[PDB]
């Protein structure tokens, strides 16, 4: 049987970056030449592996992480990067062995009145560990006094909403990102 990569890149909807979606791929074959051959992906950067030389490599598990961010923030989906996304939403380790794939989806994830259902985490006391998925809705205590779940001054909701309008610039248009993590071997080419 073939690997279900079509269910990820082709999903009619994508998850927010703070609650990023992950697909565990095991016990199947897959040809990665089909993916790189397509020039629809604006970004396609592999780390510690060759794109074409992947059909001859077997891996124990292959993780596919998919979410949506801004065009300006695609540069943060890479090892050793900082920023609101890499620190508080999706962090890649320094020894990352995989590939980062992204493409512009301003035609899909952008309402004319503004698509606000794609969110990101704006407040966090410390950065995320690699592959950490924080989905807490707890109010952020930025002041000396506690919040007790009462959103207000020095007590802000930790998440912020993307303002995805089709009139936005490329850096502000939504980009659908898929991050492949190459970890008995069950996924070959």
């Amino acid at each position: 049987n073939l690997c279900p990569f079509g269910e990820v890149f082709n999903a009619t909807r994508f998850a927010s970056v703070y609650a990023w979606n992950r697909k565990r791929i095991s016990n199947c074959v897959a040809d990665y030449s089909v993916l790189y051959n397509s020039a629809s992906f604006s970004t396609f950067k592999c780390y510690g592996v060759s794109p074409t030389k992947l059909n001859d490599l077997c891996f124990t598990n292959v993780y596919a992480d998919s979410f949506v961010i801004r065009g300006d923030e695609v540069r943060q989906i890479a090892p050793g990067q900082t920023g609101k996304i890499a620190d508080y939403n999706y962090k890649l380790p320094d020894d990352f062995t995989g590939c980062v794939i992204a493409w512009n989806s301003n035609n899909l994830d952008s309402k004319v009145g503004g698509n606000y259902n794609y969110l990101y985490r704006l407040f966090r006391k410390s950065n995320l560990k690699p592959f950490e998925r924080d989905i807490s809705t707890e109010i952020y205590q930025a002041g000396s006094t506690p919040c007790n779940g009462v959103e207000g001054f020095n007590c802000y909701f930790p998440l912020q909403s993307y303002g995805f309008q089709p009139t936005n610039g490329v850096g502000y248009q939504p980009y659908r990102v898929v991050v492949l993590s190459f970890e008995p071997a069950t996924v070959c080419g």
Epitope: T12, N107, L108
Partner: antibody, heavy 127, light 113 residues
Framework: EVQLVESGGGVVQPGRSLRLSCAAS????????MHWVRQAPGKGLEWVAV????????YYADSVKGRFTISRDNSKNTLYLQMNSLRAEDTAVYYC????????????????????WGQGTMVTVSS | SVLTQPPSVSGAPGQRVTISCTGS?????????VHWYQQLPGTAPKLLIY???NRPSGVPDRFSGSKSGTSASLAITGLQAEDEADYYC?????????????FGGGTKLTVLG
């Protein structure tokens, strides 16, 4: 097969009422929204109204505002258009067309088009 | 504000014709998408282009769409006699933010038989 069958059209005196029914089959009618589009003879298309997946909100063109009422029965997979106080300019071929999927579609529902049209029921108005 | 289409375009078989569709600040200039419909005489409209440039499965590759600023264009390459029909562009209106759509006046394509 995905199929939209509308009926209930005919001839009626001005100022009187008429109701059109649009049967749907071959797709999860509950999720998609539904449109009503009319076309006078020889002229172009003119959008009438639209209704959501649940019917919470409705939108109408100014030509039929207050006179027409759109509704849907998701348990019956049927679309309705209550035409009251009809005028002569309402004489046209009335189609029902599938709108976008707001439930499990794309976020930009404007990306969808009227992909499935009906066969067109006919209405005429004269005294 | 509605859409403006040429009343009729004409082209010999094998040629390429284009149908324009100009709008305003409340529809195509507001960044909405443009859909194209083909209507044979006496029949219901058929969706030719959705989302400015995409073709539904079953539509011949001869048809193509585009959009720029406040206008959209439908390109029919290699005209066939069967392409003689009426063509409508459709977008959405944002005068007041709700959900309103706008059609064009329609273009009668006549292949020089």
């Amino acid at each position: 097969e995905v199929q939209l069958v509308e009926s209930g059209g005919g001839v009626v005196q001005p100022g009187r009422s008429l109701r059109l029914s649009c049967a749907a089959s071959g797709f999860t009618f509950s999720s998609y929204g539904m449109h009503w589009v009319r076309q006078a003879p020889g002229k172009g298309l003119e959008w009438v109204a639209v209704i959501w997946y649940d019917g919470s909100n409705k939108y109408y063109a100014d030509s039929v505002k207050g006179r027409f009422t759109i509704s849907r029965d998701n348990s019956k997979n049927t679309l309705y258009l209550q035409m009251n106080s009809l005028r002569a300019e309402d004489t046209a071929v009335y189609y029902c067309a599938k709108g976008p999927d707001i439930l499990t579609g794309y976020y930009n529902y404007y990306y969808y088009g009227m992909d499935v049209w009906g066969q067109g029921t006919m209405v005429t108005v004269s005294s | 504000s509605v859409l403006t289409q040429p009343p009729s375009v004409s082209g010999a078989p094998g040629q390429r014709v284009t149908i324009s569709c100009t709008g305003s600040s409340s529809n195509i200039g507001a960044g909405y998408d443009v859909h194209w419909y083909q209507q044979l005489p006496g029949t219901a409209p058929k969706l030719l282009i959705y989302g400015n440039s995409n073709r539904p499965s079953g539509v011949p590759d001869r048809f193509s769409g585009s959009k720029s600023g406040t206008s959209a264009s439908l390109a029919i390459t290699g005209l066939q006699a069967e392409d003689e029909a009426d063509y409508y562009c459709q977008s959405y209106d944002s005068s007041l933010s709700g959900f309103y759509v706008v059609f064009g006046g329609g273009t009668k394509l006549t292949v020089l038989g």
